[PDB]
Write a protein that binds this ligand. Structure first.
Ligand SMILES: Nc1nc2c(ncn2[C@@H]2O[C@H](COP(=O)(O)OP(=O)(O)OP(=O)(O)O)[C@@H](O)[C@H]2O)c(=O)[nH]1
Ligand SMILES: [Mg+2]
Length: 190
């Protein structure tokens, strides 16, 4: 997509933006680079703020791209890993009351294997039959030669449906860019 502005920081539906526009929201361990992915697709450095390595994103952030879509940035599973569950109620409601939600891009790190939270997430995300675009990120930190031994583990771990799709990615080198935008567009222009 020949592709960039914030709109709001909703903590509940009584805040979600207006317009009834389409949205793709992200789910990911904390620090995984969800805030980064978002930026990588619409070509921004820190529109969605990134951080050294903490738990910087802390609210559902809506980013209207070309006034045609909505990327929604989300805190990592549980921000400060009680607050665990506090996190769910929110992502859940949303992913069960936001009809425009046109799919969830769940991002996991390629290097390691999906943490149960990721299987969990995906599971839930699947119980509601929400289309998902898994993203093996930070490819660039894995010897190009071993991206199969790593990305095979995911598929098995998250045992990803055949309807859903895994994609290798880099917020550094931008690898997986378009693939993302393609799948993301299948979901939008379905
Ligand atoms: N080398 C590398 N670093 C990455 C990559 N993606 C994200 N990072 C680094 O990881 C850190 C956190 O990235 P973010 O995008 O803020 O993380 P996040 O998952 O959105 O974090 P929260 O908003 O707290 O959930 C930063 O220092 C980024 O520069 C990637 O593909 N390669
Ligand atoms: Mg984030």
């Amino acid at each position: 997509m020949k592709v960039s502005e914030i709109v709001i920081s909703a903590v509940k539906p009584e805040q979600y933006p207006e317009g009834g526009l389409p949205e793709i929201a992200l789910a990911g361990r904390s620090n995984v680079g969800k805030s980064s992915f978002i930026n990588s697709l619409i070509n921004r450095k820190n529109l969605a703020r990134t951080s050294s390595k903490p738990g910087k994103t802390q609210t559902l952030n809506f980013y209207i791209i070309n006034d045609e879509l909505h990327f929604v940035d989300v805190p990592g599973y549980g921000f400060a890993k009680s607050e665990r569950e506090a996190w769910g109620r929110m992502i859940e409601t949303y992913i069960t009351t936001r009809e425009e939600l046109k799919a969830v891009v769940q991002i996991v790190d390629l290097r390691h294997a999906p943490s149960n939270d990721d299987v969990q997430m995906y599971e839930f995300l699947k119980y509601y039959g929400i289309p998902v675009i898994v993203i093996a990120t930070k490819a660039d930190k894995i010897p190009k030669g071993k991206w199969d031994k790593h990305a095979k583990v995911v598929r098995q771990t998250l045992n990803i449906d055949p309807e859903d799709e895994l994609i290798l990615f880099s917020s550094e080198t931008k690898k997986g860019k378009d693939e993302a935008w393609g799948a993301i567009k299948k979901m939008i222009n379905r």
